[model samples]
Target: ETLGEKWKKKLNQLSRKEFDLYKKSGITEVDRTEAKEGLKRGETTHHAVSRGSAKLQWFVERNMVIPEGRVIDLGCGRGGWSYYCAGLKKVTEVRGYTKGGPGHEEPVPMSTYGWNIVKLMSGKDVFYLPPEKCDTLLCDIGESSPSPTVEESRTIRVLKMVEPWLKNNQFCIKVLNPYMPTVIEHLERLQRKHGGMLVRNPLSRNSTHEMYWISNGTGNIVSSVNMVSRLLLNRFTMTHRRPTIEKDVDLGAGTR
Candidate 1:
């Protein structure tokens, strides 16, 4: 799931200064083209809006996962999913936390993200990040959570598809029903494996095979409808630019 709605409007008409910074962070050639088209259209498709990751937010809101403080998106490819975690709904401050991994070359620590590589080079404003100190942690690293394999490397990546959250410290993770048993065992064992209490909760519904859990306190699970509403309303309230495309920009074409 990707771009849809006013997403394009916000990205386009970006000051040349802003556009330049984005170029520095190093976007895929395809994303560069997509960004250009999105700007031209003045609208956004779910894919275009999300840089191609609508499912992330779709799943989170579909399950009513609560957002409180300090949301961090691990492995924030193109940083689209993180947008949902912060912009669509609301998070104290959603940071796109990333570190290059498994690349043909050596690894880079994720801590480097805040360095403004994207901001200074791409003209992407560090301020664009969700306001700091929102008091919630909305982390959804598709495959960057810490794990055992990390023992050998300086950085660890976690990609538990439709798996539960790690409860070592305190946070919930998403999971799918079909893999309940295996994921449950994974959490328990993972806890011991990491010398911490890994936990999970089955939150996905049949309508959508997704679930999430946190080790800390409980959070509210919202419906997909609510999530969409939250996203739209957030845009409206913030007066985020409306999509520029006057017509459709769907996967097949047409319908911003």
Candidate 2:
């Protein structure tokens, strides 16, 4: 099936209640009109494409490289990736968590998920979940040069905390906005501990920053996918695609 067909298939599988979550994606009162109209035409090509684009970084992207199991997303921003995966990838369900940091507005839900249906977990961004909730997890953390170490540390804390929940799932990490050596070092460490592989894709006009794709296991990476080739492909693809991460993975960083 074409990418369009795949998305429609997933949309059809959603229950009425689940389908309603789409409207929660609206950013404003008028925006809700578009979302509502889209729902009425959910299976239509226009609706499907609209759904994907609106949720682009979430999972509106196509990657023939590797097939994944269930999926999860961190720093899920405005529920884009979560909606994309759940609405597009059909991965059981995607969890998009926001720690609601300073100056970071709590994301308003897409109409489909209802307004604030999911509660904010106290203050630490910790929440309970099934032991092996997903086959794959993607994390799109921060990467600002001036204070990257702080952001990286927070993301690391979250990832390590969530890592434990995964028994044997694949993992992906999103990097860049302005690549950092510190992030590269952290990736290298994760590689040693988890034994995954890394590939880099530098910046392009389409991206906010270049990306680094880290895989938890050696597996099939197919499609006309553009990986981290300095000159071979686009840079902002990863950020644009909205990568996910395994939140339950246990890491030792937060203990001290």
Candidate 3:
């Protein structure tokens, strides 16, 4: 199995100590307290926990796909997913961009990891693209926003970022409230205009967040379609299930 696949399989089993070791080793420099505070304030995406592992698992399970060549990680939260991608043999380099705030006083410490391929840049200049084209682009900004309008704007901004690079690159965007009609319509327009297959699958079993994987290449459409159909089936089962009486009684008791 690939290194990414192997690592993803062990994500759920990673202990707190292991995560702590990552911090202690200076691999990732996010402070736990600050991350919690950020979450409470609904500020930035610099959380201590590695939400990237879940995203990596979703990427791998969809067809064992690993990003190749250079990659740009926009709004890289805590640098987990970017670091994960850098470790893969297929990926040559990873450039993570973030608008730094509170917890992330400095760029995520990537030099300590010894790979020399992953680096973090902090700035408001998200529109600046590299001279050379990238192979993969990941956008995960404002994913936990309460307002749909806020979320939609973020998605649109990410789409604009994709526009200059969309000709031959792969894009994986984490979009919240994927079921909304407006979001769906925009995504449809993207597909129609770009001429690439856009496939979405939930980030987790109970998550409202969904990952949309789009590629101009036509080779992976079959596998991506299969993944989506399977997820649709799972959603059908989950959404149509009847609530148990014990759960209903617990809700009733709480209300009283």
Candidate 4:
């Protein structure tokens, strides 16, 4: 049957909850196999895309650059970072990763002209790799509907997984705006370790149920936190002050 006919058939079989999640996220199947498999697998079902322009715009607002060298996307659900880097960021290459290791493979791609979401952790691999080392690393690993515990774990998991592999001058990450303290603390430590400056996306922090990014740090990261906090939270705020050690990785210094 044609793809549209197949979607009609598949749509008829979805549970009310499944159908609801599908529509709610504005997701569409990458292809026939992905459509069938996403319906069957709970984890893979979130592998879809939407407009990434606002996120890209937010990065540019903070004077973020599209590094000319390679880029790596740690939790590249639906190719948001990868596609933006390939098509707009003008990077040399992009390496994409997902939890399932490309089982459904996300429809491959047609544009080497743009960027390819090359899944790097297909089988056994530690902290996934890019073509060589990369100039920038991006990760957006937000959970769909997570409890406090699940959110904390997933947040830590991505931080740990990317820590070893993010050998780049720029680290651009997105996290759930609330729920976890570790995310902010860990990124702050990374910034201090590298002698970089931390730049938070103020546009997002002022909103609810939103996501935000943290750039580097310049030792002045803490003082600005209060100003940022006032704009972000109306009531309470959290701060992280701790030292951290990182294994040697290749890269240079950059501002957020």
Candidate 5:
């Protein structure tokens, strides 16, 4: 059973209390025991967006080759995933994109984070990510009750904008599973078209969200491209420029 279901079971066994007591009670037993263990909670929304940890732990535990190139975190709620990935020494750079710019989202703790956190309304704003662009695309963006048309538009917009910059890149994507299946269906079609495949199928431990990833040939592409040559000759181009983060503000907003 899920956490909510377990809570429901426990709730049924409780006797009537002083009606006003409901306002004073805390979630005594509704800890993570009913969900995934070691799952970080408390001040959760203010920090990174790690939950369940089945996805986050997959990298180190399996010793997967960290792409170690540029990574772009789309809809980077409070910049948790970016912060985590940056600390892993897995990638050389980490850029985060969200609607809430620097002043809104909490500033990254590590001052030397080799990446910028910026805002993006559509794919256009993402161009400043620097060509020889992101090798790993980490999108945990989702809509609670998204329209079908809007979902497809956003999905295709991102894929089209980023796919050309990919050289055997990876994508870790999570979305609300309501109306976006066909969008995902299209994504799977494109992944195969570009010689990529899913690393993990869409999975949900709770009823709220589902996630998956795809490998577009990251390492294999590197082998063919000759990274040493590109590293020396790669030209950085951007239609837009990176934003300066506000050093004074660390507002924890817009992880949604």
Candidate 6:
């Protein structure tokens, strides 16, 4: 099975305790403290876990399809996913945007998470649109709002921003299922306007968030093989990159 398929299966079966362990293992020691403080400051850890885990699952499921260029995380509350992306060896840069609503006067800086490659920006002025060229655009916003109309509106607005960048670029969005009908209409429009594939999947077993993975690349058997081959290459490269750790293993002189 592909890594993503295996991961999806694993994620479906994961218990809360195992999920927590996965989160802890993924975060650095220093970031763990900052994550705690952010939670204390009224930031929802639920958002952090749900969005972060969903992104991770997406990445692994795609066979570690790192953008290897630039990424923008719209509505990046607490910069959790930005931190996660910054830790990736292939991701060159990560930018997070947050408008800082009611309780959050100023969002916590991404620097607190110890990733220098991530930059946090105020989304208040730009209206959630990408200011520069973006290789990967991520939007996990508006799920907190009470009204589905409001959520659908914001999602469509973001999708409009994604249209210009759709060619050869990728976008991942999280939206509530109730708002998906209208949202899917716009997504279908994009697919027609641009020759790409739009994939919709549930974020988790019981989660309200539905994830959309849109790419402006052909979705055919050849492309599927290419993705799998790229995954194998990445796995091979990663194993070689960490050769030092294996070299340090103690082997008996006689055995060697």
Q: Say which candidate scores most in lDDT.
A: 3
Point out the worst 10-residue segment of candidate 5 by lDDT: 229-238
Clashes of each: 51, 39, 0, 7, 3, 1
TM-score of each: 0.34, 0.46, 0.57, 0.53, 0.47, 0.55
lDDT of 1: 0.33
In candidate 3, which residue ranges exceed 4 Å CA deviation?
1-49, 103-107, 110-114, 125-132, 193-209, 216-256
Model 4 residue runs over 4 Å out of place are 1-49, 88-90, 100-113, 116-132, 144-146, 177-184, 195-256
Compute the lDDT of residue 238 as modeled in candidate 3: 40
Encode model 4's per-residue lDDT on 9-43: one tens digit a residue.
Answer: 45445577654543323211222344335435642
Off by over 4 Å in 6: 1-54, 103-106, 110-114, 123-130, 144-146, 177-181, 194-209, 216-256
By lDDT: ranked, best first: 3, 6, 4, 5, 2, 1
lDDT of 2 by residue, 205-238 (tens): 2222334345534432221122322222222112
- Taken over the whole model, the C-alpha lDDT of each candidate is 0.33, 0.39, 0.51, 0.46, 0.42, 0.49
Best by TM-score: 3
lDDT of 1 by residue, 1-256 (tens): 1221132234344477653443222211223355446546664333333332334433344443454445544445445444444443334455554443344111111211122221111222222333233233334333221221221121112324212323222233433221223333454454343332222222111122223444333322223323432343344234223222222112222211
Task: State the lDDT of candidate 5 residue by residue for 72-147, as single tens digits.
Answer: 7766655555655654445767676765544344333332232233332322235355444677777665553223
Q: Give lDDT: candidate 2, residue 228.
A: 25
**Better model by lDDT: candidate 4 vs candidate 5:** 4
Worst 10 residues of 6 by lDDT: 247-256
Write candidate 3's Cα lDDT for 114-182 as tens digits. Answer: 236877777644656543478877766645454545656776666666666665566676554344445
Output the worst ten-in-a-row residue range by lDDT, candidate 1. 104-113
